[PDB]
Write a protein that holds these residues in place. Structure first.
Motif, short mmCIF file in Angstrom:
data_model
loop_
_atom_site.label_atom_id
_atom_site.label_comp_id
_atom_site.label_asym_id
_atom_site.label_seq_id
_atom_site.Cartn_x
_atom_site.Cartn_y
_atom_site.Cartn_z
N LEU A 285 28.31 22.72 30.43
CA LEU A 285 29.46 23.60 30.47
C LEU A 285 29.31 24.77 29.51
O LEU A 285 29.78 25.88 29.80
CB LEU A 285 30.74 22.82 30.16
CG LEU A 285 31.21 21.85 31.25
CD1 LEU A 285 32.27 20.91 30.70
CD2 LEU A 285 31.73 22.61 32.46
N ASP A 286 28.65 24.56 28.37
CA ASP A 286 28.47 25.64 27.40
C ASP A 286 27.51 26.70 27.92
O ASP A 286 27.62 27.87 27.54
CB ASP A 286 27.96 25.07 26.08
CG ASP A 286 29.03 24.34 25.29
OD1 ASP A 286 30.08 24.02 25.88
OD2 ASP A 286 28.82 24.08 24.09
N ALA A 287 26.58 26.32 28.80
CA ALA A 287 25.55 27.23 29.28
C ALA A 287 25.91 27.90 30.60
O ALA A 287 25.04 28.52 31.22
CB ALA A 287 24.23 26.47 29.44
N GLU A 288 27.17 27.80 31.03
CA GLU A 288 27.55 28.37 32.32
C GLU A 288 27.41 29.89 32.30
O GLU A 288 27.81 30.54 31.33
CB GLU A 288 28.99 27.98 32.66
CG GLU A 288 29.10 26.74 33.53
CD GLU A 288 28.80 27.02 34.99
OE1 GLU A 288 27.62 26.93 35.38
OE2 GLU A 288 29.74 27.33 35.75
N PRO A 289 26.84 30.48 33.34
CA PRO A 289 26.71 31.94 33.39
C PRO A 289 28.04 32.59 33.72
O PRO A 289 28.92 31.95 34.32
CB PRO A 289 25.68 32.15 34.52
CG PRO A 289 25.89 30.99 35.42
CD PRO A 289 26.29 29.83 34.54
N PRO A 290 28.22 33.85 33.34
CA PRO A 290 29.50 34.52 33.59
C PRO A 290 29.65 34.94 35.05
O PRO A 290 28.71 34.91 35.84
CB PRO A 290 29.44 35.74 32.68
CG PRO A 290 27.99 36.04 32.57
CD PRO A 290 27.29 34.71 32.60
N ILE A 291 30.87 35.34 35.39
CA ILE A 291 31.18 35.90 36.70
C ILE A 291 31.06 37.42 36.59
O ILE A 291 31.81 38.05 35.84
CB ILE A 291 32.57 35.48 37.18
CG1 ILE A 291 32.59 33.99 37.51
CG2 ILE A 291 32.99 36.30 38.39
CD1 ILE A 291 33.97 33.46 37.88
N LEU A 292 30.12 37.99 37.34
CA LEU A 292 29.84 39.41 37.26
C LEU A 292 30.73 40.20 38.22
O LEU A 292 31.30 39.65 39.17
CB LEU A 292 28.37 39.69 37.56
CG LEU A 292 27.36 38.99 36.65
CD1 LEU A 292 25.96 39.51 36.90
CD2 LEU A 292 27.74 39.17 35.18
N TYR A 293 30.84 41.49 37.96
CA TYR A 293 31.65 42.40 38.77
C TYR A 293 30.77 43.25 39.67
O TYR A 293 29.58 43.46 39.40
CB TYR A 293 32.50 43.30 37.87
CG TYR A 293 33.83 42.71 37.47
CD1 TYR A 293 33.95 41.91 36.34
CD2 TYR A 293 34.97 42.94 38.23
CE1 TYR A 293 35.16 41.37 35.97
CE2 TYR A 293 36.19 42.40 37.87
CZ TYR A 293 36.28 41.62 36.74
OH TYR A 293 37.49 41.08 36.37
N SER A 294 31.36 43.73 40.76
CA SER A 294 30.70 44.63 41.68
C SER A 294 31.15 46.06 41.39
O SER A 294 31.82 46.34 40.40
CB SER A 294 30.99 44.21 43.12
OG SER A 294 30.22 44.97 44.04
N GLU A 295 30.77 46.98 42.28
CA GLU A 295 31.11 48.39 42.09
C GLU A 295 32.60 48.60 42.32
O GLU A 295 33.19 48.06 43.26
CB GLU A 295 30.28 49.26 43.03
CG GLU A 295 30.75 50.69 43.16
CD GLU A 295 29.95 51.47 44.18
OE1 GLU A 295 28.89 50.97 44.61
OE2 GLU A 295 30.37 52.59 44.55
N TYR A 296 33.22 49.41 41.46
CA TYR A 296 34.67 49.59 41.47
C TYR A 296 35.15 50.64 42.46
O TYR A 296 36.36 50.74 42.70
CB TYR A 296 35.18 49.93 40.07
CG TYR A 296 34.44 51.06 39.37
CD1 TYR A 296 34.59 52.38 39.77
CD2 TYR A 296 33.60 50.79 38.29
CE1 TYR A 296 33.92 53.40 39.12
CE2 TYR A 296 32.92 51.81 37.64
CZ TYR A 296 33.09 53.11 38.06
OH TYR A 296 32.42 54.13 37.42
#
Ligand SMILES: C[C@]12CC[C@H]3[C@@H](CC=C4C[C@@H](O)CC[C@@]43C)[C@@H]1CC[C@@H]2O
Ligand SMILES: C[C@]12CC[C@H]3[C@@H](CC=C4C[C@@H](O)CC[C@@]43C)[C@@H]1CC[C@@H]2O
Lengths: 10, 230, 240, 8
Positions: free
Chosen positions: B12-23
């Motif tokens: 759980l500590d190593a979970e990757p983030p949720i990235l964003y797309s083009e706005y």
């Protein structure tokens, strides 16, 4: 090659 | 050296983030505009998955050649199960990014995309139907990373895979599930992994075909991962 | 309705036979002669699989359009796991037929095929390592038939399976049947969930082998390497 | 429609 370098990265 | 609780805590500590797309994307989605958004996001998530793999217990202890093989065989399965996870609470929609909410109708703009969209939506609905917990999800992702390429290179990876099986059983037992419920739920989770493997196979051929139509931009890391299956 | 032992006996009763290949093929194997022997065998096996599928407990309860969808989804997986099973006691060899025991090097006669040969041999080497029992094998083969098409949207149809709830009920019974068989083998409770996990994880590799073999057989047809019989043609065409 | 027939 890129995955190769990113794996041994710090 | 880690117990079941330490394994869940580390994953759980190593979970990757949720990235964003083009706005401000092209308001009318095109096959080229849509393929460019998904490939740009996949190329950015790959750097995060490489670092997440190094923190999976037992992955660093492998040889550097072994680490490359496992990531080459499972990178699409890992990206897909991550999308299926964050799309659980959005029926009929795939949350590629918090600012990219697409349904099966929007997937019609890319040739051969709708069947892959439907298969991804069906996995998200099944995850919703089984009430999948985040602790179970991170275990399934670690299993994919170690298991997808074990039969294409072996003994050390099977021992880690057995510990994740012990960890998953320990989670269901601590959740009040009976022993019969424990093997029944464990089998239901591992059978979904067969569909996720099937989805990555179909998605790998689609990305390959879109490169022939010259729709895939020059994303070197993503092309390198895709080249590993050619 | 049936018990765990009634489940095993019914699955053992419906087992298809082991067919044969041609008794005097082209002595130096060629690419077309090899693919001809394999497609001729597979087309004859498919007729026995359709009759076997009708005997899998719970299969006749599905609608006709649900029956076809599961068979076009898993026909290559079932044929492949059957080959892997009879190749268990032959290390480094694949028992396609009792008169067609092919080795790893002989798979190089067809372009882009030895990669699948090695994947099938590794699957057979693992079943040998875990000492897979015949009762476990017929259980996994039935899981493939019911599970490989539940969430699958075939490209030729853009639709999936309807009776989702009924399939998961039968799949839970086979899960109990599998665990029941591990208990009769004297395994502990911990050893039971681990072996059950290792068995179902190989089903992922079998799914991967079928997709790789499906694309290979499609290229062989498009290259005019081997004509495809009408039934085998229709099974392959259900995925394009 | 061969498999469609052999099932019936
Ligand atoms: C690979 C494809 C583009 C990239 C898509 C994939 C479906 C799911 C995902 C996961 C998401 O996190 C990034 C995009 C990614 C990786 C698509 C399937 C068809 C197309 O080729
Ligand atoms: C489909 C291929 C020909 C048919 C082969 C398959 C591998 C395994 C089996 C199972 C055996 O019972 C019949 C042939 C069959 C079905 C091959 C993989 C590549 C080649 O195209």
């Amino acid at each position: 090659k890129i995955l190769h370098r990113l794996l041994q990265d710090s | 050296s880690l117990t079941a609780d330490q394994m869940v805590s580390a994953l759980l500590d190593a979970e990757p983030p949720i990235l964003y797309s083009e706005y401000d994307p092209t308001r009318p989605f095109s096959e080229a505009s849509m393929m460019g958004l998904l490939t740009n996001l996949a190329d950015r998530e790959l750097v995060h998955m490489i670092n997440w793999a190094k923190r999976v217990p037992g992955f660093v202890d492998l040889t550097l050649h072994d680490q490359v093989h496992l990531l080459e065989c499972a990178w699409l399965e890992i990206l897909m199960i991550g999308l299926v996870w964050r799309s659980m609470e959005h029926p009929g929609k795939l949350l590629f990014a918090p600012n990219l909410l697409l349904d099966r109708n929007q997937g019609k703009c890319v040739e051969g995309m709708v069947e892959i969209f439907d298969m991804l939506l069906a996995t998200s609905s099944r995850f919703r139907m089984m009430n999948l917990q985040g602790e179970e999800f991170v275990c399934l992702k670690s299993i994919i990373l170690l298991n997808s390429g074990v039969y294409t290179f072996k003994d050390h990876i099977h021992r880690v895979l057995d510990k994740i099986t012990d960890t998953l059983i320990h989670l269901m037992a601590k959740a009040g599930l009976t022993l019969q419920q424990q093997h029944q739920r464990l089998a239901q989770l591992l059978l979904i992994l067969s569909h996720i493997r099937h989805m990555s196979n179909k998605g790998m051929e689609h990305l390959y075909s879109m490169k022939c139509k010259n729709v895939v931009p020059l994303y070197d890391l993503l092309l390198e991962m895709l080249d590993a299956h050619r």
